[PDB]
Amino acid sequence: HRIRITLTSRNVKSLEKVCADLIRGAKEKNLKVKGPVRMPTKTLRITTRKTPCGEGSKTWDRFQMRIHKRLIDLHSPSEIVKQITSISIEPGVEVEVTIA
Amino acid sequence: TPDIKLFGKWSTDDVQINDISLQDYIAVKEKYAKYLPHSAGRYAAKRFRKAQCPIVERLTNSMMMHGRNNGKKLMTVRIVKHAFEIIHLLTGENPLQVLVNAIINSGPREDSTRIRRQAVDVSPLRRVNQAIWLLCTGAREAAFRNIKTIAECLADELINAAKGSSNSYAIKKKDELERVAKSNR
């Protein structure tokens, strides 16, 4: 009965708006809801040379990936969440539902 | 004690500041009391934020020198705290008073500089900068390759500076610099 839904994405506006819209479909049925846990963000780090060959002054780069993740728990059966996981999804957000 | 302060066991009071030229640049009494010669820092950002610093902390701020000992304030306070008793067990009086006569007597009045040299007067803050400096590198060679430890050499020189006995490094370099300025003056 205790089902967990993962909300992970790259763009902050892409993940913040879909976490709250998935909350909006939860209170309408008025079920056992949990709030959004915000885990610390992972940042992939690549600093490499700018020049193709090894000529010139030495300049580097600042490539970043500030990826974010949110988990939401529910004491709800797998049936009624499958009516909410079919609506309000943007393709930049990665969702993996954890049944148990 | 919220009224008085003890520098470890050293009293805050009874240090008369002899020279009136430096008393506005010696922060040592009744507004500048600390139990440690160690604060968080912050004194070295503004132009004249160096004027109200406690002088014993200033010497430790200048003692962490020559590479390997930079960034090691934890042990130079362990040097001067040991060195303060060395002054007392030779004099019997306030060891901090000896420092007052040390920085007063080791600061050169006139100093030649690249202008042909014109000998000119110096600032009291420049003067307390040099007086604290010339002794701080003088003891740096006295313990260098010698059985006499750095705690004693730090304590031995300002003892020899408070009387101006001219056997310390800081006294010699003050009067020669006042004299080579007296050449092109």
Binding site: - | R78, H82, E85, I86, L89, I147, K148, T149, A151, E152
Partner: protein
């Protein structure tokens, strides 16, 4: 360069120059009594531990790096 030929162990006069003369100084540390009497620093510390059991010097600061001694209290 110049050899500082320090004494490894006392003589019968040097140690006798220690039982009376060291309690006359106002400053006693292993760095000056070893230099004033030409002994090693190891012998310097090992010349004052018995003086603690002899009671001819007073300890006011012992440390890892620095131990100092004096006379006793004048009375």
């Amino acid at each position: 360069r110049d050899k500082l030929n320090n004494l490894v162990l006392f003589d019968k006069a040097t140690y006798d120059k220690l039982c009376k003369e060291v309690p006359n100084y106002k400053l006693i540390t292993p760095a000056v009594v070893s230099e004033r009497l030409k002994i090693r620093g190891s012998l310097a510390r090992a010349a004052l531990q018995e003086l603690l059991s002899k009671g001819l010097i007073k300890l006011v600061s012992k440390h890892r790096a620095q131990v100092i001694y004096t006379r006793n209290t004048k009375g």
